[PDB]
Scaffold this active site. Structure first.
Site: not given
Length: 274
Positions: A81, A83, A96, A203, A205
């Protein structure tokens, strides 16, 4: 024995087993600039699948076909993941990693017609059109994280779900189909194309108490299916099959990107009923 027995108005049933692998992308863009903000890479490492195909040739020039495959159970995956939280930096700021990601399930079905335009003793060539839907689901658990360019790092609780993710791709498609046969050997190849893919994802989270939903329309798909087989009897063909599929890229329009590539390799038996 001799050559295959193919009668008018016959049909075939085939089943095969093997493996699915691939990689999906879940994207967030800045709609204003086009700049990528987030990218989650969802891997399918090894998933055991069962695949089936039924075909009917009501005419010499026309084949009707229903096929599909499914995961037999959950399988192994991975998720990373990324960003890009700093607009003034090209490298991502956050990453991550979740090696303990499960592929909960995956499935596909494809309903189509083939029209044979060229046919002779050893070759066949035609056009195909159909409708196909593919679904994938993962759960990323535990893992580790590096934020702010590695300044801050730590671990998620082991075994605890962090992010759940699923994708669905649905499309009408068109394509070309070919077959080559000599003696008891048979090779089939299909090339499939679409500019009309509808993609959806969800998704969860879990640790942020947030759910995302993305949808895109009018994206492109390319796929191939190659099958090589041997008629051990005139009605029974043992075969190996390879497929490859590429689906190009709350959250909508210019903000969303949803993509997948996958391949399958299976082996099985096809039987033709006169």
């Amino acid at each position: 024995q001799l050559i295959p027995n193919i009668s008018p108005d016959s049909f075939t049933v085939a089943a095969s087993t093997g493996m699915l692998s691939g990689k999906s992308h879940e994207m967030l863009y800045d709609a204003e600039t086009g700049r990528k903000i987030s990218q989650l890479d969802w891997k399918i490492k090894n998933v055991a699948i069962l695949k089936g195909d039924i075909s009917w040739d009501p005419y010499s020039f026309l084949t009707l076909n229903a096929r599909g495959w499914t995961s037999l159970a959950s399988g192994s995956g991975n998720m990373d993941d990324y960003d890009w939280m700093n607009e003034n930096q090209s490298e991502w700021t956050d990453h991550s990693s979740h090696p303990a990601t499960n592929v909960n399930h995956a499935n596909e079905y494809d309903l189509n017609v083939k029209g044979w335009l060229l046919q002779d003793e050893n070759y066949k060539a035609g056009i195909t059109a159909g409708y196909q839907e593919t679904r994938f689901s993962w759960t990323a658990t535990g893992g580790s994280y590096s934020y702010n360019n590695g300044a801050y790092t730590g671990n998620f609780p082991k075994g605890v779900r962090v992010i759940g993710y699923n994708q669905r791709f649905s499309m009408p498609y068109i394509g070309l189909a070919g077959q080559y046969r000599i003696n008891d050997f048979e090779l089939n190849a299909l090339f499939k194309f679409s500019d009309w893919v509808r993609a959806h994802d969800n998704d969860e989270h879990y640790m942020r108490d947030l759910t995302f939903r993305e949808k895109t329309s009018g994206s492109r798909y390319y796929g191939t299916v190659i099958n090589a087989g041997y008629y051990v009897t005139p009605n029974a063909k043992v075969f190996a099959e390879f497929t490859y599929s590429k689906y190009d890229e709350s959250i909508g329009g210019d903000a969303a990107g949803i993509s997948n590539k996958n391949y399958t390799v299976t082996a099985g038996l096809q039987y033709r009923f006169g």
